[PDB]
């Protein structure tokens, strides 16, 4: 299992995040606890699962999965890096005012319920889930700060910013002495390239790690055999090269600069080994351009657009 | 219901706020908490209170019956804004024992916890100074405030009868030190009284603060008085029969005519009854035409910003 | 002379401040200000009256070096507060007045689409070549006060040193915010137009502007000054020197009468009924939130 | 003539930005200026030095204009944004121009090898020593316009005030992150090449007399059919576009000929319908801001 | 009773602050709480207190006695402005263990929680530093009352017997960093020892401290020779009480009354043995000094007035 | 010559500082044959230096201080407006495009620090300007001063120029440690008192107190009982003070320089230096001074 730091900030994780989207509705919470349990003999140490994971009525499953299995001891609270998010509303449809978004009010009663359904007094890593552009830089930080100045949680992320939001978001904490965004969780892999133009960008020259959300796009990435889309070529090419989808969708992010690692959603424990194997490939100079050819990116702004 | 930002920052507010002081004094309980119960399914979330509602020997009647509020659970201490405030003085009415009213730190720590307790909460979502006090200064302010904040005590500050060099001086006096300043003011404003848009409104506009309109009705006077001799107060009627001209009631046009002006977050109404509840909310959703407002600035004329208000 | 420091910077001026009047006879009226100790000097209006303070200093004899000298800043840039309209209002009244530098530089009226990072690089540079001293407003309100000289603080600056306001008996709604503003930060204030126009200069004898309940008022008024003996030209500027946080008035003599006057009204102590009477006649408003809440 | 802040600031530019043998020229900027167009941009849609003439002419050119050029696309620092280059590109620049202030001074292009706290020490010697009034950027990407700006708000110094991108019917990808990064900060937004190169000005048109080349490029070019529909020229609706789109302070123009010059002007008062708007948008669609345009 | 703002703080405090330094060692808690109970009636809402109070082996018992009265309940703890102090070695006199006096955070951290123990209260409203320790470093200072202001233990933080520039530096130090700084100065003034006014009350004022003056008689030697040193002093003390009889007033009272005219005096520490002592305490806050007693305390007393004048120019 | 750090800061100065009073040219030049450094005008001493500066790297070798020079309003005092009026006026005088210590006459109260800073800054980012200094400070005038410079990344204050001698040791109980604290050079101001511990008794052969003469005479018989000058005693007392970088001396001949040279070289014994603080007690530091 490789590791890394997560972008510029102390803390080691493993190269493959474990998503626990399934864990509760396509995952039962017996399997769920044994994919855990086999990701931590792989050595994975980085878990990542939301408040609105679940669905709908079941909100917070996820976390009251987790929850659960670390209440079942053996040092498995104290050595995964957990991660959480706040942003979403835990009612479905349209909510009442200030029970989504990043409000100091929904903060508060977001990472209170949090915590305790996932059973610990802190989040390793707490995220937004996405950007709120009516919540101000200063009042964001006031409450993680409160946060980390009880011990409630260590590090703060991003998920789905925009780069400049990244900058804004960093530079105001450091005016003032406090740790900024750490990471960001942006939707990349090779059917969608878009985050290279500015996301990636911000986050290297800001010093946040990149864990990339649904990076086999969804599965669509991972193997048309369980049947635009001329594309998914890729398929060929890779039966040609005797390499298995899901794990060349994997290795590829894996080989980007800037790139923590995906978060992998395993339904199986079988699916988790498959992802462990795609941490080892080395996708060959050949394959690399091939791929290339196949998904194009653009690249950083301005050039993407202009020169 | 209609929703806003209050000013910059990222809370979103009714554009009615639900006023209490008339719970306890003159509404009880049981009723009050009717009239709150309407209130939240009429999608407004933000209510308004203070230490010292409850008068005389009553003070803190209202921050529990809102106690008692929270207490029947159903969401209700979830779902809401919960403002309150402090400056006042909490014993019997007259000059205060030093350091019982205004805004040392001393008095700011004895009041929010003494407020905590009545409420039934282990937070209030909007702490207002009830007023300026100019003998404590900001540095000593936000300390006390700060350490609120820090222990989850309070999320946000406001400030109620302020000049706007005051708000200026609180968000300049913040800002240098990271803290999240004054998020809203509340301010007398009505059709009768327009002076806070010299200053008062303006400063509140560069700065990013929420404006709330107290005593939208002049404690009555566009609320129909005239029609009702069927506070004394001249020169002081073609208001109503303007009003009786066009089909409008007095007390929902001055709550619509607030809504309008730029800036206002919205007016604090003050029902005694639910159905002066629900007169607000018609109040919400009135349009008040290019041609009737023409005609009610026309009675009564604001001076517009400083320095051209008096000057150029 | 009476001589106060100009809010709470070092500058010490007279409480007199001389104005713009209407070239041979402005240059007599400024030596003779000077000898009644008048030492702060402003080109005051709402381009010559600067080519004359000018013509002043080539004179010699130290005329620049004993005064303050104070100077305020349509084409797209050619007004208002941005950089480029200071630079080249600065740079042509630095080359109307033939000094190389101006004491107290003031802002005409606030510019609300101009942020004060702006305004206060346009400033730092003149204040760092040498070309300025201080920095004033005219019609700011309150908080544009408080604002423009919390931003300054940030960065070192010294901000505002002054503000000049409409003030006089008459309107007295500068007494609101923008004096307590200006008293909180430390600004001097300068009171313009004084006498109202000339209403309070006892223009009802001199008729051997405004009048409807107006006339009332200005009426007791005259009345009063006659039952004590007292002229209304002398009067309106002592009162302002009782305000609390005034500097002093300005004043734009033509003759040297109007100066002696002035002078006389520099040196006028008020009684105490003749206060609370003027009061009487000439309610203001207090400062808000009392003005019109509690 | 219709007139804009800058972004933020407080200098007010007309909405037309006037780009680029000498005494053509000379007499096109006096008709600009006649016109009301103050604003006036060294980027091509010698070139200072023709400024620098039109100067010496006297007649208060100079006092009306509002001047904006650019650093200079190798022997090392004669490129890119070291405080070297950026010293004696502004050295050359003021001789050239004959004039000893700029009034806005811009980036050509980020420049990933310096950091912000180099470029704003040289921008700051120049703006203490008078030298220049206010710095713009070019050919940002939206998070390099938040680092500048947070940088300079650090020490006092004022920042970017304008960012000048390109931007037009077919290339709408500065609405991803550049122009909301530009809104946030209060930049005045430029549109370079708001035509396309020739393309949204009649250009299939003109071939009854760039890459016209590609069939589905064509096929959208339905635009010059939409505006005969409705009887609007093409090279005005093109630039009046780029007018209704938020954050955009004006396209940067280059008329050579009287009528050149009318047709800009008419396009800054045209007012567009609704329905050409929907019409044009249903055309040439745009990205949305991110993350929404790839994510949600 | 006249009330004043402690400097420039919001706090109003009485214009007399109880000393309570005679509460254990010579007053018994029975009695001092009748004293702080008649305090209390007489509108003195500002109680100064000191852990080390007691003396040898019963430091601390003077915090016990206000805690004792405090558990009386009536409105009494929050009825008053609660100071007390940090600095003295609070076990057996005689040189303290290292770091069981002076102004570590580690002394201060130890310090505060046996005082609140004994005070009986979550918080104190004035925590004040006993002396200046010039080698403990501002920063490390405002760290530990940083920590106390934010866990609510304490509001304000007050100095004793520093030098002016302890002053400027200490509030400098909390300015930079948005911290409320120092907001008193309990200093050693009274008509025999005016050289306060060189530098700590001038420092004081453009810092907006409240200035205190502690041992206000001197030791009772401004307070009456009449119940009975060097003979220049006793000639000064027998000139005033000469000029006192001549005025009809007790120099107990003029003592207290002169310090209540010296511009940016908060006022004295009154400290009673007795609840006679206190109401004469009252009686001196009521009395007007007259211009030639003034003048002529002067003449007797004379002060030097502010550096760099009182020795240059 | 013994030469020290001016306070904190990398200016190296003689521990004799040249005060002021065609013959004067010649002391200068022999002040600094002597090694003398560190000049100081404490107008015409101004035009002096002047007309010195004749050349050979005369400027170039000397640390030249001076003053604002201190009534008509804003012709006295630090506001930013006599600032600016006086350092002109003395550059002119000095005929020199800078002076390297620069400093205030006196405190004046009524002006802000972030005024006076505003004056210096730009004097300094002009190059006209090295260091400032102050004169007849409070030490919180000291610490606010310093303070208020350091907040902006400005140097403050390098120097206090106080009152400072046997008689006179009133200087220690604040100005001093405040200076020592922001590490000021403290130049000690009218070392022998005006002249009182030059050997005024045996001159005789300002104050006809005989208080104050028995105090003289106990020094001036300890002196000769030692075989010691004091004209030499009074200026090598102080160089033993803690913080003082050295006193202020107007040489007017090659005998009066060379006598202050001997002073500045001369080691004191510990039982002379006991015996100089019997007969002239200092008050120590406040708040010790007055509390405990
Ligand atoms: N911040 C945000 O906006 C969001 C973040 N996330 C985070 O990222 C994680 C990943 O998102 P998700 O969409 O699940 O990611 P993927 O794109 O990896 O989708 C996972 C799915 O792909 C298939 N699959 C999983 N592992 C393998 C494998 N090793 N080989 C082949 N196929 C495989 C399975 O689909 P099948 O049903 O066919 O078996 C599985 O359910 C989440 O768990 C969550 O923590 C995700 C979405 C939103």
């Known amino acids: 299992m490789e590791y890394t730091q997560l972008g510029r900030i102390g803390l080691k994780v493993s190269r493959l995040v474990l998503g626990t989207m399934?864990?509760?509705?396509?995952?039962?919470?017996?399997?769920?606890?044994?994919?855990?349990?086999?990701?931590?003999?792989?050595?994975?140490?980085?878990?990542?699962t939301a408040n609105v994971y679940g669905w709908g009525e079941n909100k917070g499953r996820t976390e009251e999965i987790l929850g659960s299995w670390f209440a079942q001891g053996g040092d498995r609270r104290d050595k995964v890096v957990l991660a959480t998010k706040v942003y979403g509303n835990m009612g479905?449809?349209?909510?009442?005012?200030?029970?989504?978004?990043?409000?100091?009010?929904?903060?508060?009663?977001?990472?209170?319920?949090?915590?305790?359904?996932?059973?610990?007094?802190?989040?390793?890593?707490?995220?937004?889930?996405?950007?709120?552009?009516?919540?101000?830089?200063?009042?964001?930080?006031?409450?993680?700060?409160?946060?980390?100045?009880?011990?409630?949680?260590?590090?703060?992320?991003?998920?789905?910013?925009?780069?400049?939001?990244?900058a804004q978001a960093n530079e105001t904490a450091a005016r003032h002495g406090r740790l900024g965004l750490v990471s960001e969780?942006?939707?990349?892999?090779?059917?969608?390239?878009?985050?290279?133009?500015?996301?990636?960008?911000?986050?290297?020259?800001?010093?946040?790690?990149?864990?990339?959300?649904?990076?086999?796009?969804?599965?669509?990435?991972?193997?048309?055999?369980?049947?635009?889309?001329?594309?998914?070529?890729?398929?060929?090419?890779?039966?040609?090269?005797?390499?298995?989808?899901?794990?060349?969708?994997?290795?590829?992010?894996?080989?980007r600069p800037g790139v923590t690692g995906p978060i992998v959603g395993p339904r199986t424990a079988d699916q988790l080994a498959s992802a462990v194997r795609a941490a080892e490939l080395t996708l060959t100079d050949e394959v690399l351009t091939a791929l290339d050819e196949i998904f194009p990116g653009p690249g950083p702004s301005p050039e993407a657009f202009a020169w």
């Open 185 to 255: 969780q942006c939707l990349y892999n090779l059917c969608e390239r878009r985050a290279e133009m500015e996301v990636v960008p911000a986050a290297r020259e800001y010093g946040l790690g990149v864990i990339a959300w649904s990076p086999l796009h969804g599965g669509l990435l991972g193997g048309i055999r369980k049947e635009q889309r001329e594309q998914i070529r890729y398929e060929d090419l890779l039966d040609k090269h005797g390499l298995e989808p899901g794990e060349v969708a994997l290795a590829w992010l894996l080989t």
């Open 92 to 166: 479905d449809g349209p909510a009442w005012p200030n029970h989504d978004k990043l409000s100091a009010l929904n903060i508060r009663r977001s990472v209170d319920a949090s915590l305790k359904r996932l059973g610990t007094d802190h989040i390793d890593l707490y995220q937004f889930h996405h950007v709120d552009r009516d919540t101000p830089w200063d009042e964001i930080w006031q409450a993680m700060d409160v946060l980390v100045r009880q011990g409630k949680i260590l590090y703060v992320g991003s998920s789905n910013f925009a780069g400049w939001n990244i």
């Open 22 to 48: 399934n864990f509760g509705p396509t995952t039962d919470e017996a399997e769920s606890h044994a994919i855990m349990d086999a990701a931590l003999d792989a050595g994975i140490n980085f878990f990542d």
